[PDB]
Amino acid sequence: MASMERFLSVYDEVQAFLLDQLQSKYEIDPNRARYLRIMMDTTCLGGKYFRGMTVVNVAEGFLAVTQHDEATKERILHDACVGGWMIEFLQAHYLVEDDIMDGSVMRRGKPCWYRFPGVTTQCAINDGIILKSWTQIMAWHYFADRPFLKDLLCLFQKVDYATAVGQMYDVTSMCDSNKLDPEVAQPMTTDFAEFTPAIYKRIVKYKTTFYTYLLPLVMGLLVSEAAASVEMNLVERVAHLIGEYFQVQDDVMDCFTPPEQLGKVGTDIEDAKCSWLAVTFLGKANAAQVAEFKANYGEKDPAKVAVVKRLYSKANLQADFAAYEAEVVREVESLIEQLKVKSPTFAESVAVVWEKTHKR
C-alpha cells in the first residue's frame, strides 16, 4: 500500500473512533458530532501532511532493513500513521489558536476557522483545545499497550510546551524585553536592538522546529523501536538547522510571494515581526537605511509597508540568502554524514526531509 493512501485511510479510522467514542462515552448528540467532524476536516486536512508523513517515511526506512512478521510491519505502519496524525492535529491546534491570536484572515486560501459564520471566536478557541485533546485520546487508545507509550507521551508533551514557549517568544519579539510587564501596555521597540540572529534563532527553534522536524523524526524512531540507531544530539542539531532554514523561506515568502500563491496576504512588516528579512537587513544597513526602516516598520499604512519592501529590495538580501543557503547545505550534509555512523537508513530519511524542504 502507498504511504499516503495509508495515511489518509488512518485519518478516516481515527475520525470514526473519536466521534464514535464521543457518542458512547461523552453523551454527544448527532448534530454536535457533525459540527466536530466538520471542524476536524477543516482544520486537519488540505495541507501536504509533511509532518505526519515524515513519521511514516522514517518508519518505512527501518522496515526495509529490520526483520519482522507481516502483521508487525502493518502494526508499525499503523502506529506511524496514528503518530503522524497526532502531530497533524497538534499543528491544527496551533494554527486555529494562532490565527485567532493574530487576527488572521486567511490560511491556505480559505478563511481561518474562527471566521467561519457558525464558528466564531467563542467556539474556535475551544475547538482548538479539543484538537489538542484528541492527540492524547488517540495516543492512549492506539498505544495503550505499546512499550514506547511513555517515551512518546513525554516527548510529545515537551514539544507541545516548547511550541507554546516559541509562540510567546514570537508574539513578544517586537517589544523590548526589559519593558515586558502585564500591568503596562507594550510599546513596539524603537531601537530594534533585539533583532539579532541569535534572538531570531531562538524564536524559530521553539516556535517551529520542535513540532515540524524534531517530533516527526523522533516519533518515527519511537514507533520503530529504533531510538538506539541514532545519537539523539545529532538528531536535535539537524532538526534545528533544517527547521531554521524552513522558517527563513517562510519569512522571505511572507514579504515577496504574491498573496494568491502564498495562501495569505503577508503582514510580517505591519506586525513588526522579527523576520529573517528584518534581522538580515539590520545586519548590513547604513545609518540612513536604519532610520528609514525605523520610521516605517510595524505600521498598517501601505505607503510605509512599501517603503520597507523598497528598502529590502535595494539591500540585496538575495545575496545574504544564497550565502545562508550555502552554509546550511554544508552543515546539513555534515550532520547527515555524522548520522550514517549509526544509521544509514535514518540518515537517508533526514536526507529526504532536507530535499523536501530545500526545494518547495
Ligand X SMILES: CCN1C(=O)CN([C@H]2[C@H](O)[C@@H]3O[C@H]2c2ccccc23)C1=O
Residue ranges of the annotated binding site for Mn(2+) are: 98, 102, 170, 250, 254
Report the nearest approach of Zn ion to the CB of residue 344 (Å): 35
Q: Which window, 71-79, 160-168, 215-223, 290-298, contacts a copy of itself (CB under 8 A)?
A: 160-168
Smallest separation (angstroms) from a copy of itself to the CB of 167: 5
Q: Within positions 162 to 191, which residues make up the interface with a copy of itself, using CB under 8 A?
A: 162, 164-165, 167-169, 171-172, 177-178, 180-186
Per rule CB under 6 A, is residue 211 in the interface with ligand X?
no
| Measured CA distances, 80 to 3, 15, 60, 62, 227 (Å) | 10, 16, 9, 12, 14
Draw the binding track, 18-57, toward a copy of itself (x: CB under 8 A; -: no contact): ----x---xxxx-xx-xxx-xx--x---------------
Binding mask 241-280 for Zn ion (x = CB under 5 A): ---------x---x--------------------------
* Residue 77 phi, psi dihedral angles, 5° rounding: -70, -35
State the binding partner of 180 from Zn ion, a copy of itself, ligand X, none, CB within 5 to 8 A by kind.
a copy of itself
Sequence positions preceding breaks in the chain, C–N over 2.5 Å: none
Question: Least Å distance between CB 182 and ligand X?
Answer: 25
Q: Which residues pair with 107 in a beta bridge?
A: 110
Q: How far apart are CA 31 and CA 67, in angstroms?
A: 47
Contact between 298 and 173 (Cβ < 8 Å): no
Task: Give the integer Cα–Cα distance in Å for 24 and 127.
Answer: 20
Is 11 a binder of ligand X (CB under 6 A)?
no
- 240 or 273, CB closer to Zn ion? 273
Closest approach of ligand X to the CB of residue 207, in Å: 12
C-alpha–C-alpha distance, residues 288 and 300, integer Å: 22
Q: Retrieve residue 290's grid coordinates.
A: 536604519
Q: Is the Cβ–Cβ distance between 249 and 278 less than 8 Å?
A: no
254 binds, among a copy of itself, ligand X, Zn ion, none (CB under 5 to 8 A by kind): Zn ion
Q: Which of the stretches 101-109, 200-208, 209-217, 320-328 binds Zn ion when contact is defined by CB under 5 A?
A: 101-109
Reported as half-sphere exposure (CB side, CA atoms, 13 A), residue 263 has a value of: 8
Phi, psi of 161 (to 5 degrees): -65, -45
Draw the binding track, 141-170, toward ligand X (x: CB under 6 A; -: no contact).
--------------x--xx--x--------
> Residue holding cell 514570537?
170
What whole-number distance in Å separates Cα of residue 213 and Cα of residue 251?
Answer: 17
CB of 250 to Zn ion, least distance (A): 4
Of Zn ion, a copy of itself, ligand X, none, which one does residue 318 interact with (CB within 5 to 8 Å by kind)?
A: none
Cα-based distances in Å from 47 to 96, 110, 184, 327, 338: 14, 12, 39, 29, 32
**Residue 178 contact among a copy of itself, Zn ion, ligand X, none, beta carbon within 5 to 8 Å by kind:** a copy of itself
* Number of chain residues interacting with ligand X (CB under 6 A): 10
Which run of H or E residues covers position 332? Answer: helix 317-340
Decide whether 240 or 264 has the Cβ nearer to Zn ion: 264
d(CA 95, CA 40): 13
Contact window for a copy of itself (CB under 8 A) among 132-140, 212-220, 305-313, 336-344: 132-140
